[PDB]
Amino acid sequence: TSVKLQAEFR
Amino acid sequence: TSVKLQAEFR
Amino acid sequence: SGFRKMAFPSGKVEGCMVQVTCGTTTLNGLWLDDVVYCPRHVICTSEDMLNPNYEDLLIRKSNHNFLVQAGNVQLRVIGHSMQNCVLKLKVDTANPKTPKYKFVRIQPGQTFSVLACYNGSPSGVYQCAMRPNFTIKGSFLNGSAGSVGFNIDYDCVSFCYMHHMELPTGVHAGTDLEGNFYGPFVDRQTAQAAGTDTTITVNVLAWLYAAVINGDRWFLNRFTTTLNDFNLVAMKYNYEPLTQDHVDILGPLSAQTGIAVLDMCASLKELLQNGMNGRTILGSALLEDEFTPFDVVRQCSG
Amino acid sequence: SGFRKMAFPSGKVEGCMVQVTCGTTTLNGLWLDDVVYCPRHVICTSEDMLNPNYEDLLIRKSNHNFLVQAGNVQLRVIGHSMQNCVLKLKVDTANPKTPKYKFVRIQPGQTFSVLACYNGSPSGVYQCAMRPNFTIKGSFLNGSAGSVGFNIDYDCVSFCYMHHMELPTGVHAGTDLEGNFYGPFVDRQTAQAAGTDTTITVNVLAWLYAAVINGDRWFLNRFTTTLNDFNLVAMKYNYEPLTQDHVDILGPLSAQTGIAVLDMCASLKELLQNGMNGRTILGSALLEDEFTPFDVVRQCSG
């Protein structure tokens, strides 16, 4: 439902 | 109505 | 002959991709001379995602907080600065693989080839167009932020796009190489929907020009129309207006084919009204707006 | 999310593209180690093209009759020999940008990236498939002979195609890197016609899996079908029969979606007999068969 920033988090 | 060889001729 | 969706050879850009890691967040950077460019949301943790204070999040960072990696070699960061939504990181080593390049900002309807990477390693390349709502329809998974979209003229790579995020609709958004986003977007994880999408009218004419060169002829119309009358019907089906510049840019193809641009408009009017009647154009049952007049000329004329 | 026609980064292949000129005929050459491969009709004049004997034409040419140019470097040829439809030119300088390569021969239904070149300079990349009738549907103009098709495993370039000619229908024919043509074709501008083309069934199925991973699901159904009953009706709509190996390689695509292979085969059975009824799959109004099961894992999974 929301925007996804497409770096690699974790 | 035939094939064409596709190197550059003169 | 034939017509294909075709990208630029990504060789000169393949030598410019690096890995960037602040903390445990990882993405890609663009290594040009002694500068690395990348999105600013690399300084964000998994938590600061709703409303992140990139200014307040960057003051706490120092040079040794950015692990920039070019293959199996890490580049010492000696300076960092933020500029709009991108971060520029100065490095002690200038890239030996830097080609001639410009930082351009493209208009809606112009094309560019995206080289999608993950962890600084190029994965593939495809061509995309800037939709009227200033998004693109690419293919990005996590770790794609930092990928660049570019056009190559001569031996110069005009960098024009850098990827950043994905909308709920699934389309892709980002910035130019100076951080200014393409459209009304922000680098926050909020519910965002772009503008209403229209059809790139000039490209559809350009794509129908490639079809006549390639043998397709059944959609042609003998009788002409006007720029005033076509734009009247153009917006009826959600098409961008046709300017006189659009006509001018199609000049090369109006010459190769012998069909006036306004004659091609009447054919587009008939196609819009009736459809294709289960027939195919260039192998497509839908009118394609993703090929600029330049993509058509470059692939058709010798 | 996102699924696109996507070619390998062509940089490793661009570093092998040279220009070859014999007499007045110019095409492309592939420079690997100290040997240059190129289509043999570079030794043909504009006259001896209908019914030429290349072994006759070859004895008439010696080493200094071939002019190889790699950028600003010209490679002195030291030897020449002929293997089927390609000429192997030994040069005094092994290519320093040589990647690790294998010469492979793909079978119908497999894909590869095409690097179109003119005067030895690459111009654009795109993705093609070896159609069942042993042709590809590329975009090739005059002087594009010698362009190569390839695949990159990771750091290894598998060259599997080399452009030669275009048929009257507008599709293209070529050889592997051992001069062996794909199809019943020969390198003579004569009345040659390709066999009737069929649809690569497993590539449509894999492409329907790529839609499921993206959220698209409407084409699916509750029915089941057998392999023999499916291939029967697949034959009915000019679709290739699905062998056991093809079902096997569709496995990892079935596993991640749970939709069994034969059950998605039942989805295809319903789409063949009814149609799409004005809807689009991944933005396409007709089934696409140029995306292998591999090409989908390379982009959607992971």
CA–CA separation, C219 and C237 (whole Å):
18
Check CB contact under 8 Å for D41 and B5.
yes
Q: What residue spans of chain C are helical by DSSP H?
A: 11-14, 54-59, 201-213, 227-234, 244-249, 251-257, 261-274, 293-300
Is C169 an 8 Å CB contact of chain A? no
CA distance readout (Å), D239 to D63, D189, D202: 49, 31, 10
Distance from chain centroid for Cα C238: 21
Dihedral in degrees, nearest 10, Cα atoms D242, D246, D252, D255: 30
CA–CA separation, D110 and D291 (whole Å):
8
B9: nearest CA in chain D?
D25
Is C181 an 8 Å CB contact of chain D? no
- Among D1, D8, D172, most C C-beta atoms within 10 A, so best to mutate, is D1
Phi, psi of D86 (to 5 degrees): -125, 150
Residue D254 tokens read as 């079935």
CATH at D41: 2.40.10.10
CA distance D243 to chain C (A): 27
> Going along chain D, which residue ranges are E strands?
17-22, 25-32, 35-39, 66-70, 73-75, 77-83, 86-91, 100-103, 111-118, 121-129, 148-152, 156-166, 172-175
Give rounded-to-5 percent helix, strand, coil for chain A.
0, 30, 70
Dihedral in degrees, nearest 10, Cα atoms C246, C247, C249, C250: 120
Residue D5's CB: how many other CB atoms inside 10 A? 21
Residue in this structure with the two tokens 């195609």, named with its chain if needed: D161
Residue C269, domain extent? 201-300
C219: Cα within 13 Å, side-chain hemisphere: 31
B1: nearest CA in chain D?
D168
Beta-carbon contacts below 8 Å between B and D? 66
C187: nearest CA in chain A?
A5
Question: What experimental approach yielded this model?
Answer: X-ray
Please list, in sequence order, all residues whose beta carbon lies within 8 angstroms of the beta carbon of residue C6, skipping any fewer than 6 positions away: C127, C295, C299, D116, D124, D125, D126, D139
CA distance readout (Å), D228 to D113, D231, D242: 34, 5, 9
Are D186 and D193 within 8 A, CB to CB? no
CA–CA separation, D81 and D58 (whole Å):
9
CATH at D285: 1.10.1840.10
CA–CA separation, C6 and C20 (whole Å):
29
CA–CA separation, D250 and D260 (whole Å):
9
CA–CA separation, C184 and C182 (whole Å):
7
Residue C139 tokens read as 């293919």
Name all contacts of C235-241 with Cβ < 8 Å and 24+ positions apart: C236/C272, C237/C199, C237/C272, C238/C198, C238/C199, C239/C198, C239/C199, C239/C201, C239/C204, C240/C109, C240/C132, C240/C198, C240/C199, C240/C200, C240/C201, C240/C202, C241/C201
A8: nearest CA in chain C?
C143
| Strand D156-166 with D100-103, pairing | parallel
Check CB contact under 8 Å for B6 and D44.
no
Chain D environment of C284 (Cβ under 8 Å): 285-286
Q: What residue spans of D95-139 are helical by DSSP H?
A: none
DSSP-derived 3-state class of residue D55: helix
Helix (H) or strand (E) holding C80: strand C77-83
CA distance readout (Å), D199 to D129, D203, D236, D238: 11, 9, 12, 7
CA–CA separation, D82 and B8 (whole Å):
20
Are C86 and C38 within 8 A, CB to CB? yes
Are D157 and D13 within 8 A, CB to CB? yes
Please list, in sequence order, all residues whose beta carbon lies within 8 angstroms of the beta carbon of residue C296, skipping any fewer than 6 positions away: C3, C206, C207, C209, C210, C253
Are D274 and D242 within 8 A, CB to CB? no
Are C114 and C209 within 8 A, CB to CB? no
Considering only CA atoms, which of D50, D60, D42 is closest in space to residue D119? D42
Chain D environment of C4 (Cβ under 8 Å): 126, 128, 137-139
Are D22 and D65 within 8 A, CB to CB? yes
Check CB contact under 8 Å for C168 and A3.
yes
Is C286 an 8 Å CB contact of chain D? yes
Is C193 an 8 Å CB contact of chain A? no
Residue C35's CB: how many other CB atoms inside 10 A? 17
CA–CA separation, D175 and D109 (whole Å):
16
Return the sign of the alpha-carbon dihedral for residues C34, C40, C43, C46. negative
| Strand C25-32 with C17-22, pairing | antiparallel
> Going along C96-245, which residue ranges are E strands?
100-103, 111-118, 121-129, 148-153, 156-166, 172-175
Instruction: Please report the residues numbered 136 through 165 in chain C whose beta carbons come closer than 8 angstroms to any beta carbon of chain A.
Output: 140-146, 163-165
Q: How many residues does chain A have?
A: 10
| Strand D86-91 with D35-39, pairing | antiparallel
Residue C272 tokens read as 């819009």
- Among C142, C163, C185, most A C-beta atoms within 10 A, so best to mutate, is C142
Q: How many residues does chain C have?
A: 302
Is D295 an 8 Å CB contact of chain C? no
Please give the angle made by the CA atoms of D55, D60 and D62, to the nearest 5 degrees.
Answer: 105
